[PDB]
Design a protein around this ligand. Structure first.
Ligand code: 3BV
Ligand code: 3BV
Ligand code: 3BV
Ligand code: CL
Ligand code: MG
Ligand code: MG
Ligand code: MG
Ligand code: MG
Lengths: 233, 222, 204, 222, 195, 196, 212, 125, 195
């Protein structure tokens, strides 16, 4: 039995024609206090996988260590560690999914929601979700927390089903992700303006973008809003 | 429910889905959530279904009597004031969440009211279980100086986001356009994107399938 | 101690071509104990029919109340109340007890004598009106009835065919509910004749 | 306090014919009022002509299916590649479920296949391992909507022979794979209309002596 | 208060009511009459919460007797039962409801028919051929379903009633100290002294 | 909420963020928490939106009726009416109100009214959830008889920090200037105040 | 549930219904509540479905192991006590079982043992177990005599379940009959209440409360 | 714990520890069992090199396992007490679970099983 | 399980134990023997939680019988009672205690005296001339205080016991279906078949 202390909010992601995009803001909240501002919640594993984590940050840092150790363990007695027998996104996910469910079954969960985004060896896009309960699911778009309520609706307008994936370019996909991050900044009280974004492409590989900011915001209309009903001044 | 309100050039537009739930069960697949308070003041309602209907009819009645008494067309702020003071008096127990909109001699207006009696002003608003899906669309596509046709499109798109992504919302899209100097047009079932497909089989029974014990003619006349 | 599921029971109403049908089971129990197999849940005031499920004391109380109100209506108006008007009266009366409600699930059914239009409606316990073209359901086996009606129903059924559809909807729903059954009654309502049929069903 | 269970919604349906058996299930996965996935399969080919689905709390469902699939694998190793009969699989699943009697798998499990005489078989389980062979079973969120319809259409309950005074029952007979798939599709379209947790897609797995075939159909996405 | 039964036969209504009054681990009395005569051809038995039962029964009795004097006329069993139901229906939504269950046995002189009504504390009225309140029903109803016929005599009804009491005495946990039996017919109300 | 009112040489300035929340969801990101109860008597609202609106509406009614009979009310009188409502209904209210007004005799005055319904006259006042994070800053930086531009910078920098650390505060920074000249509304957007 | 079994001149009658409920939801109408342990032993099931089904099939395995080890069929007393000692170990854990172990052996003769999940174990001639047990008792007790014929005893057991199936909301479906003799148990068919009620009503003239 | 395999096979296929245990039995005082048509009689030798004995309190050679079964023995006296105790406990345990006293065959089978367990358990003779 | 009584007289101990076994609203059995013979001259009656009672009684029985075989000697009632008390005293601080109350009636052959011990589920032992467990005591103790004499015969003890049962049958709420009476004396244990 836990309660989460220092927390991270939404992680959002989607598939596009050649790969996957994933994003998450750099905030570590302490209840209503926006305590920590330099927190990286996207963690790359190799050059083909990115694990995005929301929820308890102490448990996130534990998972970081496990993934770090997983890379080391895989390299042991493995001449093809950087080739055929390298870590796949599906391997990394199933490992985490096993841990998450084992921990919930011991009534001592890792208080997180996790999205494993990556590209398989055969070029296939990988995007799957797992949380503190051990529940897993996959979809063209995946999001955690407030992202599930606000980002998914926007991202599903671009990729509504499987057949929309080949029709979606990396430019269009990233534009939707960046827009979703702005909407979350408007409406999620535990979000920040600063965020990170990662693209895993089957051709161009892993591109990790840090220190992005929400921009092109609409606030001007606020000056016209006066009172809460009758008030004219 | 998903309900929205959007201001435009010469007026205001409100919209709503048409699903009514009873737990996880869909009770009414095509209920009307847009309510007429006065001819040019309309109301979208979310929350407890009986409460939204009852509170909107009561204030609508009192607005009519007020309009006759003062020899004036009713104002949106009057409906707003009367609704919020009623709801506040009952401390949230009347579970009515409303988007109030309309045109009057002062101009065009758009407000929201919550069950506890707080009111908000805005150019675009959304209430209900699918308000987050709708607000995501409104935040992405809204701009200043919308036309009539652009506002209807934006409003219906916001409702659609709720229909598809929120389990609490579904079925059709109702719309009401309130433009200054014109009659308000109530567009019942403006979109119907959830038509039931043809069934695979007819379940019309052969006559006599049901076993009967007694028959009798009922007297309805005097 | 859930008022709506102590006594048990179900009501269902359907529309057809120039006709309406309303049906109900006959069980009245006290939780597991079956007490009566003659407890009818459908009443009528003139040509307007009202079915009521839920707590039996409120079913009886409301029947007596609406008989009271429709009798005064007729004396002052000098005409029989219509289904559309009666529906509003039911809603008003239920919402009057908003914070101390009757634990019931009423269902109005009838044909408007002026226009000839078939009309059905349903309510929750505090008076919210649920109007429908096709069918209305109510009671402890409402989930079962919703499933049966949604699959079996088709529009513009003749009175004789409509009878079979509504009966099969009620019977099979009642057999999947422990607190419903013990007999059934079906009212077929045409413009100026009404037939009442008792159904044969399993008595467990 | 940490709650180890959740409700992922969805519904499943198993029907048995003379020389075949179907196990259907919608592809929607949900939590509360949100959609997680519009296509997340929960009906699985487990080998030896046994199809399985464990609907309810998906994490427990996936764990169970995973463990049964593994049980089949070890049954081959330990007993000279002997085919696991459907009745033996059912008993094995009881022990898997009851093994966690005091911390249950929150799932309704259904398996389908052919018995040792080549005839269609459907077995259904409660969360703690009580099981029974049946011609017909619906499980999950919309089970209460679908099941009475199946009683009426598959087992011909409450249907009497016309003109026989409700004395002669409608005779039982096996349905064709074509007629069964019609009932499955109509059951799910009806459930989709009236239950919020059911929709998006329908995936049917058909089991004959030749093998395991699949069929997919679209469902309403609201 | 515990066991009250009622059987309507061809020409009469028979009410049987337990004699025991228990408080704690002591049977304070074993000869209690759990009934009141509402009118010459109407009898009401009762069971439920202590104090409430008698207070309610006597309140009803007084009201019916007041009516009889005012109109110089006896109310029908149906009319009396409807009056009683309404009082309980008011009661259930009061500050402190009457927790009383009743059976009303009466002979309608205009129809020349016996009538038995069962009304619980919520105000739930049903006319029945045979009725019971409390745990008694869980034994007697199934027994009467089997042995009861509509055309039985008063003597056959008493034998049918003896069969119920015997079953209760065998399978009921508590000792209810037997029953007082009363018959309601065209000649009014009378008590069976040897049961 | 983050709200504040600051007296200065020419009068008084009220300041507030624009965020309204339901849990962690922002129900309104452009809220106006600065509200007029009289020509030159305004108030900052914190706590329950419903309660504070209901109170402010009643006060506005009382002061309008006061004006019809006895002429312009004092800022102290306004604060007394607020207190009376907040104190007598303390069991059913969640309202943290700052009252600020400009007289010609008394100049700028600020009264703060916390949950209990007590009244406190101060040179400047801060309130709302986000005020906790700026007690240190405001105490160190406040000076009496500041200029208009200095007071605007003081409020802007203060609420900027409150907004930065408090999740329950954000959006635009609204301000209302009360002087002999009249009533002036000011607004400041994220792109300006965030990078202070 | 409703289950019964009584002892009489011609051996043992055992009768049970076939309904399974999850609250007010009728889950099944075709459940086998009698377990066939061996040609001479039967077990009835009431309470938790899984608990009963799992542990009584387990009981059968323990009875098989006894006759392998001892070269002799297990006694009814020993069989019932294996089950009662098992559920007693789980006492307080939340098992829900109301079972009756019925059978014949040479040394014991016809024997019925009531065994429940709180550890009670009772030998007796008549037992009714389940949510509708009281309704079955009412009919069974009032018509029971030791000198009943095999034909009349089978009917009384069937009629008693029917009485409970009718009145108890959580009982119904169909009646399963068994007769246990010196030669072993004999199955006497599945009887649907749908047809059985009306057949009994018409022929017997009972159930006058119901609209005919 | 002491684990040593004391009872083990030899090249010729014998377990010497078991065979040497038989030599201890051969040393012990003679015991005889004869069963008639309606009875069984257990005779036992007592060596007469021990005078000044107290026959009231000296452990008897024949021991009751239950009210209906008896056990006599030959060999090490101390060892016999352990078997008799185990047999007596099993006799009461059988009455408790089976609701019937042990058969003579069952009791023998149990005692024999104990003796066997000590021929292929580590650390024991 | 409910009523268990015990009376020690001049030359014997008499134990009376109710026959009813009730679960819910049904008397499942009316001929239950709530006692076990621990040894030829020692008898233990019991009452309490379902399952626990018989499981405990038989566990004690087996242990005493094991002792009798081992030593070819019968333990004294005092020794047996002390053994039983210790087992209950261990039990009360266990994970799940035995909720069983017992009376141990025995005849000590060495002293030639009858002995009655009352032990509750906590392990509280007392030797008494007369004893009871549960609500029975609240009637019988005062009755025995009055009518009991130490020099009474077995026949006088049975009449004294009949007086207790009659009082219980009159004032107890529950029907306990009479009692099985057993006598323990110099000649061992025997049952009174007609009571
Ligand atoms: C979306 C769908 C969700 O927010 C919308 O907001 C809509 C609003 C439209 C319809 C105006 N909300 C609903 O439809 C609303 C959701 C809801 C459910 C429960 C409580 C509050 C809100 N649905 C209802 O209000 C239904 C309407 C029926 C289908 C006509 N009503 C019920 O579910 C009632 C609840 C009444 C109630 C009383 C007191 C406090 C709150 C609600 N439930 C029942 O009647 C159930 N049952 C009937 C018989 O008696 C036993 C109980
Ligand atoms: C900052 C945010 C904190 O100091 C400010 O003070 C602002 C003040 C501005 C608006 C004047 N405060 C709020 O925005 C205020 C926070 C709050 C919440 C609850 C009690 C006191 C203060 N927010 C509200 O009042 C919102 C306004 C609605 C969204 C328009 N209302 C609610 O949160 C309602 C009110 C319930 C309530 C509780 C206690 C006293 C009065 C009212 N709450 C809900 O609807 C709860 N909701 C249930 C469903 O799940 C999500 C939460
Ligand atoms: C009569 C017929 C009814 O009382 C009998 O007493 C029968 C005995 C027969 C079945 C052997 N008892 C039942 O029918 C019994 C009642 C019951 C229910 C729950 C607990 C104890 C007793 N029913 C069951 O056991 C059902 C069997 C169904 C029909 C498959 N199962 C459940 O109720 C299950 C598992 C219960 C459970 C016990 C202990 C721990 C966890 C679970 N529960 C669910 O299915 C839960 N639920 C049902 C609806 O779907 C959503 C989830
Ligand atoms: Cl506000
Ligand atoms: Mg039923
Ligand atoms: Mg749907
Ligand atoms: Mg902020
Ligand atoms: Mg039934």
């Amino acid at each position: 039995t836990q309660q989460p202390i220092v927390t991270g909010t939404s992680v959002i992601s989607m598939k596009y024609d050649n790969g996957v995009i994933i994003a998450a803001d750099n905030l570590g909240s302490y209840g209503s206090l926006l305590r920590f501002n330099g927190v990286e919640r996207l963690i790359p594993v190799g050059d083909n996988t990115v694990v995005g984590i929301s929820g308890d940050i102490s448990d996130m840092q534990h998972i970081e260590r496990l993934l770090k150790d997983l890379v080391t363990e895989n390299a042991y007695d493995n001449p093809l560690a950087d080739a055929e027998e390298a870590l796949e996104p599906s391997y990394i996910f199933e490992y985490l999914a096993t841990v998450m469910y084992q921990r919930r079954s011991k009534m001592n969960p890792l208080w997180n929601a996790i999205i494993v985004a990556g590209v398989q060896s055969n070029g296939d896009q990988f995007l799957r979700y797992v949380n503190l309960l051990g529940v897993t699911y996959s979809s063209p778009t995946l999001a955690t927390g407030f992202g599930a309520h606000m980002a998914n609706p926007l991202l599903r307008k671009v990729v509504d089903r499987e057949s929309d994936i080949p029709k979606t370019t990396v430019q269009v996909a990233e534009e939707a992700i960046v827009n979703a991050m702005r909407v979350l900044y408007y409406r999620d009280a535990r979000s920040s303006r600063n965020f990170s974004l990662a693209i895993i492409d089957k051709n161009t590989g892993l591109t990790f973008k840090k220190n992005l900011q929400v921009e092109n915001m609409k606030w001007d209309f606020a000056k016209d809003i006066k009172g809460y009903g009758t008030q004219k001044i | 429910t998903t309900i929205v309100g959007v201001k435009f050039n010469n007026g205001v537009v409100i919209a709503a889905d048409t699903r009514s739930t009873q737990g996880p069960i869909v009770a009414d697949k095509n209920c009307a959530k847009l309510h007429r308070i006065s001819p040019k003041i309309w109301c979208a309602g979310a929350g407890t279904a009986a409460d939204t209907e009852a509170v909107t009819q009561l204030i609508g009645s009192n607005i009519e009597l007020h309009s006759l008494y003062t020899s004036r067309e009713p104002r949106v702020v009057s409906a707003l004031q009367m609704l919020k003071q009623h709801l506040f008096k009952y401390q949230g127990h009347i579970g009515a969440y409303l988007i109030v909109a309309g045109v009057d001699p002062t101009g065009s207006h758009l407000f929201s009211i919550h069950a506890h009696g707080s009111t908000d002003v805005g150019y675009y608003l959304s209430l209900g279980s699918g308000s987050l899906a709708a607000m995501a669309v409104l935040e992405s596509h809204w701009k200043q100086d919308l036309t009539k046709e652009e506002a209807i499109k934006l409003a219906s798109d916001a409702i659609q986001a709720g229909i598809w992504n929120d389990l609490g919302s579904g079925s059709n899209v109702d719309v009401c356009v309130m433009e200054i100097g014109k009659d308000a047009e109530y567009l019942r079932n403006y979109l119907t994107p959830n038509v039931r497909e043809e069934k695979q089989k007819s379940y019309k029974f052969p006559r006599g399938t049901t076993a009967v014990l007694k028959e009798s003619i009922v007297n309805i006349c005097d | 101690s859930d008022p709506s599921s102590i006594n048990g029971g179900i009501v269902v109403a359907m529309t057809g071509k120039d006709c309406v049908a309303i049906a109900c089971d006959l069980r009245l129990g006290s939780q597991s104990l079956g007490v009566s197999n003659k407890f009818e849940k459908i009443f009528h005031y003139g040509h307007v029919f009202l079915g009521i499920t839920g707590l039996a004391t409120d079913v009886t109380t409301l029947n007596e109340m609406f008989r009271y109100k429709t009798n005064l209506y007729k004396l002052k108006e000098e005409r029989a109340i219509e289904p559309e008007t009666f529906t509003q009266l039911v809603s008003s009366s239920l919402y009057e007890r908003r914070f101390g409600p009757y634990f019931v699930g009423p269902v109005v059914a009838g044909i408007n004598s002026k226009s000839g239009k078939p009309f059905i409606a349903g309510f929750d316990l505090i008076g919210c009106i649920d109007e429908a073209k096709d069918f209305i359901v109510s009671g402890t086996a409402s989930d079962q009835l919703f499933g049966m009606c949604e699959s079996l129903y088709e529009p513009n059924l003749e009175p004789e065919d409509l009878f079979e559809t509504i009966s099969q909807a009620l019977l099979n729903a009642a057999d999947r509910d422990a607190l419903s059954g013990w007999g059934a009654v079906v009212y077929i309502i045409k413009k100026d004749e009404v037939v009442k049929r008792y159904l044969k069903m399993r008595q467990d | 306090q940490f709650n180890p269970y959740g409700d992922n919604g969805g519904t499943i349906l198993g029907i048995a014919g003379e020389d075949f058996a179907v196990l259907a299930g919608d592809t929607r996965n949900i939590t509360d009022y949100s959609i997680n996935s519009r296509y997340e399969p929960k009906v699985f080919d487990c080998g030896d002509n046994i199809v399985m689905s464990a609907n309810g709390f998906a994490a427990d469902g996936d764990a169970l299916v995973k463990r049964f699939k593994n049980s089949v694998k070890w049954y081959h190793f330990d007993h000279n590649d002997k085919k696991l009969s459907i009745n033996s699989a059912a008993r094995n699943i009881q022990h898997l479920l009851y093994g966690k009697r005091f911390f249950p798998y929150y799932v309704h499990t259904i398996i389908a296949g052919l018995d040792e005489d080549g005839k269609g078989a459907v077995y259904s389980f409660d969360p703690v391992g009580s099981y029974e062979r049946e011609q017909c079973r619906a499980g999950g969120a919309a089970a209460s909507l679908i099941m009475p319809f199946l009683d009426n259409q598959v087992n011909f309950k409450n249907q009497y022979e016309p003109g026989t005074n409700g004395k002669v029952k409608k005779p039982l007979k096996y349905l064709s794979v074509e007629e069964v798939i019609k009932l499955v599709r109509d059951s799910f379209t009806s459930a989709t209309e009236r239950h919020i947790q059911v929709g998006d897609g329908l995936e049917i797995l058909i089991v004959t002596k030749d093998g395991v075939r699949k069929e997919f159909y679209e469902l309403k996405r609201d | 208060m515990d066991i009250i039964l009622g059987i309507r036969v061809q020409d009469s209504v028979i009410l049987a009511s337990s004699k025991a009054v228990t408080r704690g681990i002591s049977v304070l009395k074993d000869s209690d009459d759990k009934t009141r005569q509402l009118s010459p051809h109407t009898l009401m038995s009762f069971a439920g919460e202590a104090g409430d039962t008698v207070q309610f029964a006597e309140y009803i009795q007084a009201n019916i007797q007041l009516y009889s004097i005012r109109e110089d006329y006896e109310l029908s069993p149906q009319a009396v039962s409807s009056f009683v139901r309404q009082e309980l229906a008011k009661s259930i939504r009061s500050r402190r409801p009457y927790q009383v269950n009743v059976l009303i046995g009466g002979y309608d002189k205009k129809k020349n028919k016996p009538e038995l009504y069962q009304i619980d504390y919520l105000g739930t009225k049903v006319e029945l051929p045979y009725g019971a309140h409390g745990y008694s029903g869980f034994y007697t109803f199934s027994l009467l379903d089997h042995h009861y016929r509509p055309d039985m005599t008063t003597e056959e009804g008493l034998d049918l009633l003896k069969l119920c009491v015997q079953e209760l005495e065998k399978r009921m946990p508590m000792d209810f100290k037997g029953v007082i039996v009363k018959i309601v017919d065209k000649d009014g109300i009378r008590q069976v002294d040897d049961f | 909420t983050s709200i504040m009112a600051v007296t200065f040489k020419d009068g008084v300035i009220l300041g507030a963020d624009s965020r309204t929340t339901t849990g962690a969801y922002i129900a309104n990101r452009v809220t106006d928490k600065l509200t007029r109860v009289h020509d030159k008597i305004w108030c900052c609202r914190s706590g329950s939106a419903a309660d504070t609106q209901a109170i402010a509406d009643i006060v506005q009614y009382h002061l309008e009726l006061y004006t019809s009979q006895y002429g312009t009310p004092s800022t102290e009188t306004a604060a007394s009416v607020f207190k009376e409502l907040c104190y007598e209904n303390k069991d059913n209210l969640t309202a943290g109100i700052i009252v600020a007004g400009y007289d010609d005799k008394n100049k700028g005055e600020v009264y703060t009214i916390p949950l209990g319904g007590s009244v406190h006259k101060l040179p400047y006042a801060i309130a709302g959830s986000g005020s906790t994070f700026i007690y240190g800053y405001c105490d160190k930086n406040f000076r009496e008889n500041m200029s208009k531009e200095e007071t605007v910078d003081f409020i802007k920098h203060s609420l900027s920090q409150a907004i930065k650390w408090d999740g329950s505060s954000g959006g635009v920074i609204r301000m209302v200037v009360l002087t002999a000249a009249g009533v002036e509304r000011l607004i400041f957007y994220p792109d300006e105040y965030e990078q202070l | 549930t409703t289950t019964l079994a009584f002892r009489f001149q011609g051996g043992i009658i055992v009768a049970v219904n076939s309904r399974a409920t999850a609250g007010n939801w009728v889950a099944s109408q075709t459940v086998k509540k009698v377990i066939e342990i061996n040609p001479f032993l039967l077990g009835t099931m009431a309470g938790g479905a899984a608990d009963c089904q799992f542990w009584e099939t387990w009981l059968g395995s323990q009875c098989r192991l006894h006759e392998l080890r001892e070269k002799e069929r297990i006694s009814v007393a020993a069989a019932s006590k294996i089950l009662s000692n098992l559920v007693y170990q789980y006492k307080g854990a939340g098992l829900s079982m109301g079972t009756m172990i019925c059978g014949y052996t040479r040394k014991e003769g016809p024997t019925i043992y009531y065994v429940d999940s709180d550890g009670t174990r009772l030998k007796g001639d008549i037992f009714c177990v389940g949510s509708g047990q009281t309704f079955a008792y009412g009919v069974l007790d009032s018509n029971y005599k030791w000198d009943l014929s095999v034909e009349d005893a089978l009917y009384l057991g069937k009629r008693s379940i029917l009485a409970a199936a009718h009145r108890d909301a959580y009982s119904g479906g169909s009646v399963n009959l068994y007769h246990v003799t010196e030669d072993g148990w004999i199955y006497h068919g599945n009887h649907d209440v749908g047809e059985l009620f009306w057949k009994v009503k018409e022929e017997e003239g009972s159930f006058n409360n119901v609209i005919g | 714990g002491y684990d040593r395999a004391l009872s083990i096979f030899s090249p010729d296929g014998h377990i010497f520890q078991v065979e040497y245990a038989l030599e201890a039995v051969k040393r012990g005082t003679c015991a005889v069992g004869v069963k008639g048509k309606n009875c069984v009689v257990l005779g036992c030798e007592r060596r007469s090199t021990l005078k000044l004995q107290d026959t009231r309190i000296t452990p008897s050679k024949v021991s009751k396992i239950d009210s209906h079964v008896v056990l006599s023995f030959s060999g090490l006296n101390a060892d016999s007490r352990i078997l008799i105790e185990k047999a007596r406990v099993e006799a009461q345990s059988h009455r408790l679970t089976l609701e019937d006293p042990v058969t003579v065959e069952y009791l023998t089978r149990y005692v024999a099983g104990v003796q066997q367990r000590y021929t292929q358990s580590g650390g024991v003779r």
